[PDB]
Enzyme design. Structure first.
Site, PDB file in Angstrom:
ATOM      1  N   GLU A 181      -5.530 -27.319  -0.565  1.00 50.76           N
ATOM      2  CA  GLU A 181      -4.793 -28.118  -1.579  1.00 50.76           C
ATOM      3  C   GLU A 181      -3.839 -29.159  -0.943  1.00 50.76           C
ATOM      4  O   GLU A 181      -2.635 -29.166  -1.221  1.00 50.76           O
ATOM      5  CB  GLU A 181      -4.049 -27.213  -2.581  1.00 50.76           C
ATOM      6  CG  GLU A 181      -5.026 -26.231  -3.272  1.00 50.76           C
ATOM      7  CD  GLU A 181      -4.406 -25.405  -4.418  1.00 50.76           C
ATOM      8  OE1 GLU A 181      -3.166 -25.400  -4.588  1.00 50.76           O
ATOM      9  OE2 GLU A 181      -5.217 -24.767  -5.191  1.00 50.76           O
TER      10      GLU A 181
HETATM   11  O1  LIG Z   1      -1.335 -20.709  -8.518  1.00 53.52           O
HETATM   12  C1  LIG Z   1      -2.493 -19.908  -8.244  1.00 53.52           C
HETATM   13  C2  LIG Z   1      -3.148 -20.341  -6.928  1.00 53.52           C
HETATM   14  C3  LIG Z   1      -3.502 -21.834  -6.926  1.00 53.52           C
HETATM   15  N1  LIG Z   1      -4.237 -22.171  -5.684  1.00 53.52           N
HETATM   16  C4  LIG Z   1      -3.560 -21.742  -4.444  1.00 53.52           C
HETATM   17  O2  LIG Z   1      -4.379 -22.038  -3.314  1.00 53.52           O
HETATM   18  C5  LIG Z   1      -3.180 -20.244  -4.479  1.00 53.52           C
HETATM   19  O3  LIG Z   1      -2.512 -19.914  -3.261  1.00 53.52           O
HETATM   20  C6  LIG Z   1      -2.284 -19.982  -5.707  1.00 53.52           C
HETATM   21  O4  LIG Z   1      -1.918 -18.591  -5.783  1.00 53.52           O
HETATM   22  C7  LIG Z   1      -0.738 -18.172  -5.115  1.00 53.52           C
HETATM   23  O5  LIG Z   1      -1.157 -17.678  -3.872  1.00 53.52           O
HETATM   24  C8  LIG Z   1      -0.148 -17.130  -3.018  1.00 53.52           C
HETATM   25  C9  LIG Z   1      -0.807 -16.577  -1.754  1.00 53.52           C
HETATM   26  O6  LIG Z   1      -1.394 -17.652  -1.021  1.00 53.52           O
HETATM   27  C10 LIG Z   1       0.506 -15.998  -3.825  1.00 53.52           C
HETATM   28  O7  LIG Z   1       1.494 -15.293  -3.084  1.00 53.52           O
HETATM   29  C11 LIG Z   1       1.097 -16.501  -5.148  1.00 53.52           C
HETATM   30  O8  LIG Z   1       1.641 -15.375  -5.882  1.00 53.52           O
HETATM   31  C12 LIG Z   1      -0.035 -17.110  -5.966  1.00 53.52           C
HETATM   32  O9  LIG Z   1       0.447 -17.821  -7.085  1.00 53.52           O
HETATM   33 CL    CL Z   2      -5.306 -30.880  -3.485  1.00 54.14          CL
END
Ligand SMILES: OC[C@H]1CN[C@H](O)[C@@H](O)[C@@H]1O[C@@H]1O[C@H](CO)[C@@H](O)[C@H](O)[C@H]1O
Ligand code: CL
Ligand code: CA
Length: 512
Positions: A181
């Site tokens: 991202e």
């Molecule tokens: O908001 C959900 C997703 C969107 N794409 C991101 O690549 C992804 O990381 C994100 O989730 C979060 O991920 C982190 C771990 O990488 C986690 O700790 C957090 O709670 C999530 O919202």
């Molecule tokens: Cl992106």
């Protein structure tokens, strides 16, 4: 009673279903019989392979810590070993028999320590960060130097290949993602890359990192740009140089594909293997976005229709993407058109997605449709992302319906064939065989109506006569996959079966 007619022709529109569309990020219950696993997402941008430390960014206090060791089930001692988050992840892929897609850092720095929040004026470069260098240009160490200010990405790839062999071998790590991202780096990871990423900058960083990776393992598949969502597909989230580079391109997707194609041509090697996006529906119902919470009846109905935005030219969902960008929908054919034209031969992956309603029948039904859709729309790899922590019972049910419907890891077939329904609103249906079978035929059928059963009249075209069928399914009453009443009367390759409201079945027909 309503009757729907479904026509299945095992001779028609045969196409391979990539097993990697049965994929995930977080492991679910463990009996989904996945074929692909991803180590990716926000935590991976600042992950330091030397000591396993990473930074949460805006998800949690800009905190540097050992979260990925915890998440991976590593002990404090294992957490100290170079590469251990990734090798523990891949060892599990080898045990489960799945592809591993591993993320590499490209935003420019990684966490130096596990000592918590990094304040705005402690942004990289600072004592809290090591800088990323793509090519070490010095002898590689399996025990990397822990006291300098660097992490070398090719040294990490050499370390993996040393342990497991190359991507082309049975045990090799097969996929590497170019960070995660990038158009959200300035939002999620302001301590690492606080400026909005440029369009040219993203290409240049990507070419540099991919070259370094390919120099170690030419067979590894490089995934990018790992875009968060439609705003990034459109113009890289208003990238500051977009107007200067966009020329006649319809969207950033095309600019990136053509630029990676051009860079690959000049380098003499393919630098992008898989065009990689994240897709979280903006589809709304009952005033609620389907990925935010389960919602009310209208949210649930919208959740079950939303998969049509992937394929159906007739469907217009309620979202800002459909309101202001409908010419780019349905999304999978649009993405495929772009890839096939601007960098021919590049594959397509949806490396995060969720339709929400994780513990609701609507989320199960949506996923049962999405898995069939992805399989027959030329998607190479797709990985669910858990938006809700803890169990996601109905998402797990959808995977099990396709991949472990009997408790013995029996699966949907590897070959999609034509399955058409007279009612695309209240039903969806997906069919498959394996190795052009004329002996076993797999059908997944679902009723999206909240209120009304239908009788599904199936008309089958096949080389042999199907004589009986076994049926497994889940519904609003039980997310476990239960055996249902068998089909004992099939006459002239036609049969009828009642599908109650909010029910998904996997029907397995046999000739003998
Ligand atoms: O908001 C959900 C997703 C969107 N794409 C991101 O690549 C992804 O990381 C994100 O989730 C979060 O991920 C982190 C771990 O990488 C986690 O700790 C957090 O709670 C999530 O919202
Ligand atoms: Cl992106
Ligand atoms: Ca180092």
């Amino acid at each position: 009673a309503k009757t729907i007619t479904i026509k299945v022709d095992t001779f028609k529109d045969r196409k391979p279903i990539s097993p990697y569309i049965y994929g995930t990020n977080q492991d679910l219950a463990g009996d989904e019989n996945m074929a692909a696993r991803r180590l990716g997402g926000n935590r991976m941008t600042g992950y330091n392979w030397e000591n396993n430390m990473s930074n949460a960014g805006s998800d949690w206090q800009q905190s540097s810590d050992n979260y990925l060791c915890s998440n991976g089930g590593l002990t404090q001692a294992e957490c100290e070993k170079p590469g251990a988050v990734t090798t523990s992840f891949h060892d599990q892929s080898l045990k489960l028999g799945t592809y591993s897609l591993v993320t590499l850092p490209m935003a420019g720095y990684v966490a130096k320590d596990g000592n918590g929040s990094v304040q705005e004026s402690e942004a990289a470069p600072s004592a809290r960060w090591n800088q990323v260098v793509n090519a070490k240009n010095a002898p590689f160490q399996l025990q990397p130097d822990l006291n300098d200010n660097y992490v070398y990405v090719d040294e990490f790839v050499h370390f993996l290949v040393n342990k497991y062999g190359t991507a082309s071998t049975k045990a090799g790590v097969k996929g590497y993602a170019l960070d995660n991202e990038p158009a959200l780096w300035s939002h999620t990871h302001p301590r690492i890359h606080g400026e909005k990423v440029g369009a040219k900058e993203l290409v240049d960083r990507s070419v540099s990192l991919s070259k370094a990776v390919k120099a170690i393992d030419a067979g590894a598949e490089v995934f990018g740009p790992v875009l968060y969502g439609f705003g990034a597909y459109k113009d890289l989230q208003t990238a500051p140089d977009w107007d200067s580079v966009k020329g006649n391109y319809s969207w950033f997707v095309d600019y990136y594909l053509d630029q990676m194609r051009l860079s690959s041509q000049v380098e003499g090697k393919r630098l992008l293997d898989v065009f990689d996006v994240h897709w979280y529906p903006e589809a709304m119902g009952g005033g609620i976005r389907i990925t935010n919470e389960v919602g009310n009846d209208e949210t649930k109905k919208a959740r079950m229709q939303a998969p049509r935005t992937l394929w159906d030219p007739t469907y217009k969902e309620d979202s800002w993407i459909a309101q202001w960008n409908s010419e780019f929908l349905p999304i999978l054919p649009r993405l495929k058109q772009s890839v096939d034209k601007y960098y021919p031969g590049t594959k397509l992956a949806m490396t995060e997605y969720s339709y929400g309603g994780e513990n609701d029948i609507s989320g199960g039904i949506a996923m049962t449709d999405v898995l069939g859709i992805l399989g027959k729309n030329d998607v190479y790899m797709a990985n669910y992302w858990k938006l809700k922590d803890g169990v996601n019972n109905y998402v797990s049910a959808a995977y099990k319906l396709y991949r472990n419907y009997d408790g013995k890891n029996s699966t949907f077939g590897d070959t999609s064939v034509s399955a058409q329904t007279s009612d695309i609103v209240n039903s969806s249906v997906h069919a498959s065989v394996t190795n052009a079978s004329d002996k076993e035929l797999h059908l997944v059928v679902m009723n999206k109506s909240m209120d009304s059963a239908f009788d599904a009249q199936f008309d089958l075209s096949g080389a042999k006569t199907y004589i009986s069928g076994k049926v497994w399914g889940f519904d609003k009453n039980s997310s476990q996959i239960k055996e249902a009443a068998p089909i004992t009367q099939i006459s002239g390759n036609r049969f009828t079966y009642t599908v109650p409201p909010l029910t998904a079945y996997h029907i397995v027909l046999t000739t003998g």
